[PDB]
RNA sequence: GUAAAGCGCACGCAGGCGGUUUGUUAAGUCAGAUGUGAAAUCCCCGGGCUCAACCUGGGAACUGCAUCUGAUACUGGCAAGCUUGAGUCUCGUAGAGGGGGGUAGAAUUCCAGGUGUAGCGGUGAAAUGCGUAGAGAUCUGGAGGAAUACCGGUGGCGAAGGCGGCCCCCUGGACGAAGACUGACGCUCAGGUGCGAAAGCGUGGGGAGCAAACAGGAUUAGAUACCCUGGUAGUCCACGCCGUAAACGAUGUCGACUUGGAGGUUGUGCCGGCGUGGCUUCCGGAGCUAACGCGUUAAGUCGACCGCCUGGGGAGUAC
């Protein structure tokens, strides 16, 4: 059964990018929307939108730069079988700072750099590069 | 070149849907009586862009190799090339013609080494056996390397007809970095192709239309 | 399996309506009816293993529904198991 | 997958994991602080022995623990929901799914008789064997057991093992179309439990054909074989046991996602055409792979949980 919607969303992005899809759609959730907001404001996806009243669907517009997918790698880190939390001193750098780690802090879901600037740790959702 | 003449020449008739290369999907329009219709509303800018990139290439000391051996093209692709002082290959592409130019160049060296003997008379000196042999060597090197005798070297563009049939010539172009302009049908891959003209590449009228357009464009480029 | 009439009768008795075919009490009562009925079949056909797999599936589903009901509403659970004569 | 390695298959307790929304909590988590974390040691900065080793002053560090005060995104608890996962109902559909009973036709063998007469049978060739006490062949009648030609199909059904004439009785699952209903009731599963080809074992039946063992005839240097002529367990039935197979896709289960082509089978919608579901065969793209290959039924891209491996032999043996 489906037991990690976030890994599912990351996999949908990864597979759609590999397949050169212009967009991917998945069932929505507020956590997925927060992650997509981080992805969009960091430049990894073009845009996202949610449609539907009782069964919301989240659609992500993927982006490509020069025939290449922009999301080079996208990887789940904390997962249901093994949760990963980091204090602010031990927040991971992704690709020596050229990528991002998406962190759920008590002030919301943000990049590792934003969490570092806010002086917070949290759950390491995924690495995007 | 504008839409109506493409319908007249049947540019929009592709192959049967079962022989399609899924990567042609973006130029496909429908599947009529189970055959694929090409979206000519893209054959145009695409083609018109191909015709401008050629010009830019020609108009600048340009060397355009036409490529079309499919027997419903050989004759057709010679004259279009012949009409613009360009080179052609309309009888089987010899594996290596480009990548193996240093060897192939020696056989054209043989074509002139021997053609210039069909006139100098040298044959008036054989046991009728060896001269009627050197002639088979002529009509043979004339059949394949006949249209690239004057190329005197590698080209600045290929204008291939049927990226599927001419897959060897394109991989060679790609390997050497010479741009490829080609008619890719609904059964062919446009991957190694630099200018894709989605369109029919086995109807005589469509191939004649493309060849005429390219030859006129190259003549304009050289004249300017 | 249960006939249309026996199924509809159980649905009317245990359901909160004749349309309420999905409530846990209705599902458990239908399963209990079929299990009790099949006791006679398997008393005669002891080597009918293939059918007995379906019977054991009925038993397992009923156990799961009863556990769900007990965790969800213990009073409904108690009423149900008293009406149907189930140990637990 | 083939190098060592997916339990034969399944159900399922403990356990691990858990769709979506709101509130609440603040356990996990995170932030700050306080106490503590001996000194030495390590590390950084200095200082002393001519240098160094050594000695030594301050720091850092001791990633820990406890407490207090905050944060509330995620995870957990609690409360209320929701319907998309899971399930119930209604109507139909295909099927060698299972259990029980009955029955049909073909054939083999045996028994009785008729006709008939010198061979039959068998092999590479023979011989053993059968036959004038009348075989073999052919006809009639009877007995009995086992299996169901054709249909029949990289067809179907089943969790796997498996399942094939026809008819009835009892019974399990799957699938499709419209809805209605329940409202996360789910997934996986150590231990446990159940099922589990063939052979084998126990008791009682049955025994046509076939056939381990066994006997004879050949072959051969030998021939405890392959070939031949016979032939008993067994193969069949009931009930119990055994629990293993190259039990194989040598590929654990569940869910999601990701270009195509040609078929098979089984539903269903609309007008032979166009859709839309289930199962399934072959080819192949990206990707993957040591390669072979796999390729939407993945060996691709991911998540949950379990099983299992760690050079060859000794050994799946000894105790
Ligand atoms: Mg092996
Ligand atoms: Mg192995
Ligand atoms: Mg297996
Ligand atoms: Mg299970
Ligand atoms: Mg949850
Ligand atoms: Mg706390
Ligand atoms: Mg200390
Ligand atoms: Mg000093
Ligand atoms: Mg010190
Ligand atoms: Mg909560
Ligand atoms: Mg076990
Ligand atoms: Mg047996
Ligand atoms: Mg026995
Ligand atoms: Mg016998
Ligand atoms: Mg024998
Ligand atoms: Mg075994
Ligand atoms: Mg088998
Ligand atoms: Mg098999
Ligand atoms: Mg195995
Ligand atoms: Mg394949
Ligand atoms: Mg042993």
GROMACS .gro file of C-alpha atoms in nm, chain B residues 34-136:
model
  103
  163UNK     CA    1  -0.492   0.374  -4.007
  164UNK     CA    2  -0.207   0.592  -4.155
  165UNK     CA    3  -0.040   0.893  -3.979
  166UNK     CA    4  -0.108   1.257  -4.093
  167UNK     CA    5   0.186   1.496  -4.045
  168UNK     CA    6   0.108   1.841  -3.893
  169UNK     CA    7   0.232   2.055  -4.191
  170UNK     CA    8   0.156   2.362  -3.968
  171UNK     CA    9   0.501   2.281  -3.834
  172UNK     CA   10   0.656   2.138  -4.148
  173UNK     CA   11   0.666   2.512  -4.255
  174UNK     CA   12   0.853   2.730  -3.991
  175UNK     CA   13   1.073   2.418  -3.939
  176UNK     CA   14   1.137   2.382  -4.313
  177UNK     CA   15   1.153   2.761  -4.360
  178UNK     CA   16   1.408   2.770  -4.076
  179UNK     CA   17   1.597   2.483  -4.241
  180UNK     CA   18   1.597   2.675  -4.569
  181UNK     CA   19   1.740   2.989  -4.395
  182UNK     CA   20   2.016   2.798  -4.203
  183UNK     CA   21   2.118   2.638  -4.536
  184UNK     CA   22   2.132   2.980  -4.712
  185UNK     CA   23   2.343   3.118  -4.420
  186UNK     CA   24   2.559   2.799  -4.478
  187UNK     CA   25   2.563   2.816  -4.863
  188UNK     CA   26   2.593   3.198  -4.900
  189UNK     CA   27   2.946   3.171  -4.740
  190UNK     CA   28   3.135   2.918  -4.959
  191UNK     CA   29   2.881   2.637  -4.880
  192UNK     CA   30   2.923   2.259  -4.950
  193UNK     CA   31   2.587   2.080  -4.913
  194UNK     CA   32   2.587   1.702  -4.959
  195UNK     CA   33   2.243   1.582  -5.072
  196UNK     CA   34   2.170   1.226  -4.965
  197UNK     CA   35   1.896   1.014  -5.113
  198UNK     CA   36   1.955   0.664  -5.244
  199UNK     CA   37   1.598   0.542  -5.188
  200UNK     CA   38   1.538   0.440  -5.549
  201UNK     CA   39   1.242   0.686  -5.560
  202UNK     CA   40   1.487   0.972  -5.518
  203UNK     CA   41   1.828   0.882  -5.672
  204UNK     CA   42   1.753   1.055  -6.011
  205UNK     CA   43   1.547   1.321  -5.830
  206UNK     CA   44   1.831   1.408  -5.576
  207UNK     CA   45   2.110   1.427  -5.842
  208UNK     CA   46   1.948   1.709  -6.053
  209UNK     CA   47   1.856   1.921  -5.748
  210UNK     CA   48   2.218   1.900  -5.637
  211UNK     CA   49   2.330   1.939  -5.999
  212UNK     CA   50   2.113   2.252  -6.025
  213UNK     CA   51   2.315   2.425  -5.747
  214UNK     CA   52   2.681   2.319  -5.802
  215UNK     CA   53   2.656   2.101  -5.488
  216UNK     CA   54   2.757   1.736  -5.433
  217UNK     CA   55   2.528   1.429  -5.414
  218UNK     CA   56   2.507   1.061  -5.310
  219UNK     CA   57   2.195   0.885  -5.452
  220UNK     CA   58   2.332   0.529  -5.485
  221UNK     CA   59   2.409   0.336  -5.155
  222UNK     CA   60   2.599   0.534  -4.893
  223UNK     CA   61   2.938   0.364  -4.854
  224UNK     CA   62   2.999   0.312  -4.478
  225UNK     CA   63   3.278   0.559  -4.396
  226UNK     CA   64   3.227   0.799  -4.696
  227UNK     CA   65   3.274   1.085  -4.440
  228UNK     CA   66   3.431   0.922  -4.128
  229UNK     CA   67   3.662   0.723  -4.365
  230UNK     CA   68   3.717   1.013  -4.614
  231UNK     CA   69   4.101   0.952  -4.616
  232UNK     CA   70   4.040   0.605  -4.767
  233UNK     CA   71   3.724   0.691  -4.973
  234UNK     CA   72   3.919   0.997  -5.122
  235UNK     CA   73   4.161   0.741  -5.277
  236UNK     CA   74   3.877   0.574  -5.478
  237UNK     CA   75   3.769   0.915  -5.620
  238UNK     CA   76   4.140   0.962  -5.687
  239UNK     CA   77   4.085   0.632  -5.890
  240UNK     CA   78   3.768   0.771  -6.060
  241UNK     CA   79   3.959   1.068  -6.208
  242UNK     CA   80   4.280   0.855  -6.255
  243UNK     CA   81   4.063   0.639  -6.482
  244UNK     CA   82   3.791   0.866  -6.617
  245UNK     CA   83   4.072   1.086  -6.761
  246UNK     CA   84   4.185   0.761  -6.937
  247UNK     CA   85   3.844   0.696  -7.095
  248UNK     CA   86   3.931   1.009  -7.303
  249UNK     CA   87   4.318   0.993  -7.321
  250UNK     CA   88   4.259   0.667  -7.517
  251UNK     CA   89   4.479   0.437  -7.288
  252UNK     CA   90   4.224   0.158  -7.357
  253UNK     CA   91   4.350   0.138  -7.720
  254UNK     CA   92   4.616  -0.099  -7.580
  255UNK     CA   93   4.444  -0.403  -7.409
  256UNK     CA   94   4.359  -0.771  -7.480
  257UNK     CA   95   3.995  -0.648  -7.476
  258UNK     CA   96   4.029  -0.809  -7.125
  259UNK     CA   97   4.151  -0.552  -6.863
  260UNK     CA   98   4.003  -0.256  -7.062
  261UNK     CA   99   3.649  -0.396  -7.052
  262UNK     CA  100   3.749  -0.457  -6.681
  263UNK     CA  101   3.877  -0.102  -6.605
  264UNK     CA  102   3.541   0.005  -6.750
  265UNK     CA  103   3.348  -0.202  -6.498
   0.00000   0.00000   0.00000
